[model samples]
Target chain A: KIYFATGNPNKIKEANIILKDLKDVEIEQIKISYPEIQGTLEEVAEFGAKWVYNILKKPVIVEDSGFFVEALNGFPGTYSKFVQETIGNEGILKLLEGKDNRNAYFKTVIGYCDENGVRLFKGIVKGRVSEEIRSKGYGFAYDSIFIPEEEERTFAEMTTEEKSQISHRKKAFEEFKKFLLDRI
Target chain B: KIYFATGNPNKIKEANIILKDLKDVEIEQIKISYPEIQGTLEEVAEFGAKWVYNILKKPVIVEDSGFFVEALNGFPGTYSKFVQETIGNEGILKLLEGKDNRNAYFKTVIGYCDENGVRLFKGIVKGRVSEEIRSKGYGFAYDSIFIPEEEERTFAEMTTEEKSQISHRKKAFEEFKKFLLDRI
Candidate 1:
């Protein structure tokens, strides 16, 4: 069984949807916490994966993500969680006042670790921040304002199935699941 | 009255200690949270100061600190608080395993914002990370493992008074106090 270490139930739910095709692999939410040592998204995930594997001595996968705004010089970046908690999406909107350049991207990294060491898979979706809260489906943390380039509507307007089809998290998980499938 | 936006009671205490002689100035601890919008320490502090000022339409001071370890590729520069929460100091020690280069610096920036606009004052204390936790005087974060160049002991090993006498926060606060004293 591969233990998926995560603190978010929403993430676990999304992972379940993304990995449904992996019938032979047994994945469970282990809820193990580790210091997400800073760097890029890959670095944080890699550190968490290796740290958890060292403690559990088993296969582990950890994910780290960030929202980078080109204009604000990636204000949140690896510190997205704290920024979201402290300021929420409204503050981000405030920062975007009177600025036309709203180019941004959501990037996710999946770190897999075992005795062989750690490896990272990254997925990024480029987009722009919406003018206002477009919808409320994607939960907290910029979902309401992030308009994926692939779609005209904001991620907050999408259903779970819709988001899983084309999200940074899903893309990263696809790479992870494929790797696990090949190993098994 | 200058509203100091901070969440840490410890910081407020330290600020009071530094500004104890300012009998005419009443510095209030107004726990108003801000994005800490990312960048270098100075950038974050300056943004936070102005952000708070925009909200309250009053004079504001926002302080931002970063623990930059040369070895870790400056892992937690602007994301220090989050890194501390996710990794703690122990994880940092793990990263230092097998590496000899332990040079690091604790830099603090105090951003003062008013009708005159935002200004930043920086204070830096160069130090190295200890192999293990030396003592338990200074509270959470890197204090346990951070040893200033001037002292043989880690910050955790120093008394509060000793730390206050030569801390990055104190130095930054001193500059801030001087500025305020001059203005008044």
Candidate 2:
């Protein structure tokens, strides 16, 4: 059983869906708190994976994701969750007001660790900041303010199934799934 | 001899000024990079102090500070450095546009660790966000955008000695100095 270290239930649910098809892979959610160093998504994931593995003494996977805004120089990049809780989407809109460039992207890094050490898989979805918050289904965090490229609606306007089709998380997890399948 | 772990030379200079009177206490700068966990200033400082102590196997000190805007729900608090590097003072001004409660503060936590364990000293300087960037001397980080309480000018408008007289860093380090003096 491969342990996924994360406190977010939504992420575990998404992971289950992505790896469900792999008969040999069974992903178990381990709500273990680990130190997330101040760094890029890849660095945070790699460090977390290794740290958790040392505790669990078992194979583990950790993911770190960030939303980067080109104009803001990635203001809320590594601290997205904290930013979401404070200032939030309204703050982002305020910062982008009168700015021509609203370009942004979401990137995810999945770190898998075992006795062989840690490996990272990355996925990115380019998008732009929306003018206003848009909600249809159950959008999370910046979903209301981020509109995926080539689409008029924000991620919050789409259903989970729709978002899973081309989400950064899905892409990263799929790459991780492929790695697992290859090992088998 | 106590080692202060920090990359910034300015900090060591400030520490020297604070603890210079202590004939028995000497602080040496140690440029060692340690993991800064994403958390409150106290948590970050405590963790960093312990981490560095484990590495050096000697008494060490680590400092963490933040600029918190009450109107923005204490935004740019723990990630003050990252926020300053990214969106900068301009972004902070934008976020506070038309905000009535421009109340803010600068807080510093000094974590000192030895074989006995770890101790923390805290200092806070109440202030308000400036209307615009105000530069007079060599103001660092948010100094140009922060006006201390009862002061019409920002920290950038003051000389280094003048700013240090009432700065958060000075307050915390003075407390640390007192602790060292008591030991002797």
What is each predicted model's overall lDDT from 0 to 1? Answer: 0.79, 0.90
The deviation in Å at residue B26 for candidate 1 is 1.3
* Model 1 per-residue lDDT tens digits across residues B33-123: 7754446677778778987889888988889888888876675677777657654676567667777998888989999999889989888
Angstrom error of the Cα, residue B161, model 1: value is 0.8
Q: lDDT tens digits, residues B5-42, model 2?
A: 99888788789878888995578899877898999999
| Candidate 1 structure quality by residue, lDDT tens digits, A1-184 | 7777887777777777778888867667887887655467777887789879999889888888998877666657887876676456775676666669998889999888888999898888899998898985565569889988868888888877777667888788888877877874
By DockQ, the best candidate is 2
DockQ for every model comes to 0.03, 0.92
What's the C-alpha lDDT at position A55 in model 2?
Answer: 93
Give the residue spans of candidate 2 off by over 4 A.
none
Error of 1 at A117 (Å): 44
Question: Candidate 2 at residue B113, lDDT?
Answer: 97
